Design a protein around this ligand. Structure first.
Ligand SMILES: [Ca+2]
Length: 279
């Protein structure tokens, strides 16, 4: 399948060179996989989700996304026009309030919730969790991410936006999950992206068009926007049978475009997520 005039980040993950505008992907498109988006919520009624999104848990007064961030990230995972895995099932867990903030105890509870809830859902091709959030180092937050991964869920987390070593941030610094940095459309490390030895992979993160609340769209930037490209890619590859939740981060790194990014400090991987699609 081919989507013409795609957002640049989708085109980039299906190309060995920057500057293309078509997203090439297998028609299976993540069908049969499930992705939990742990964030401010998802506007499940947005036409771009085609009925494939639902909220399953909130830690606040409402399950509505009053912010937009969670709806944007979910759109990059799996909306029709803006998504990597266009036929996946999306589940929303609202651990952040409508200002985008949340306490670590709530974020931990939401991770433990997903590890249990996936046993009630029909996800025959596997389960992914996308965490476009973080803060300062916490061993308890890292431990919760490690538990979620151990339970059989592919966990992708944002590296953070401080132009610093991600070893000082959580859950970015948990080695056993998939920690995602951001790049821009000229194959530079995004100027805000964290770096360091704990990063596993880069994905598109600057000027990313996706869904927004009120049935709208907008473009924003962050490692929050790179993470759902990798979460969606994992769901897509698990549906194709190429990898499993336990090994998907390693598989994505092994099959990435290697050495193409600029402004990568010594000691950080130079690997850009790539779907390897051949018609
Ligand atoms: Ca890792």
């Amino acid at each position: 399948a081919a989507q013409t005039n795609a957002p640049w980040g989708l085109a980039r993950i299906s190309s060995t060179s920057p500057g293309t505008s078509t997203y090439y992907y297998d028609e299976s498109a993540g069908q049969g996989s499930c992705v939990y988006v742990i964030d401010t919520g998802i506007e499940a009624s947005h036409p771009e989700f085609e009925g494939r999104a639902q909220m399953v848990k909130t830690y606040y007064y409402s399950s509505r996304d009053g912010n937009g961030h969670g709806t944007h990230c979910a759109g990059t995972v799996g909306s029709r026009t803006y998504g990597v895995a266009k036929k996946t099932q999306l589940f929303g867990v609202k651990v952040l309030d409508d200002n985008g903030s949340g306490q670590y105890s709530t974020i931990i509870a939401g991770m433990d919730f997903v590890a249990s809830d996936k046993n009630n859902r029909n996800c025959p091709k596997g389960v992914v969790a996308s965490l476009s959030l973080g803060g300062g180092y916490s061993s308890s937050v890292n431990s919760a991410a490690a538990r979620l991964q151990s339970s059989g869920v592919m966990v992708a987390v944002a590296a953070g936006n401080n132009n610093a070593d991600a070893r000082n941030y959580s859950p970015a610094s948990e080695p056993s999950v998939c920690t995602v940095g951001a790049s821009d459309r000229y194959d530079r490390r995004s100027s805000f992206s964290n770096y360091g030895s704990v990063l596993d992979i880069f994905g598109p993160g600057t000027d990313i068009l996706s869904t927004w609340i009120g049935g709208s769209t907008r473009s924003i930037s962050g490692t929050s926007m790179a993470t759902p490209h990798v979460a969606g890619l994992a769901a897509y590859l698990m549906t194709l049978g190429k990898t499993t939740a336990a090994s998907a981060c390693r598989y994505i790194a092994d099959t990435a475009n290697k050495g193409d990014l600029s402004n990568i400090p010594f000691g950080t991987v130079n690997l850009l997520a790539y779907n390897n699609y051949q018609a």
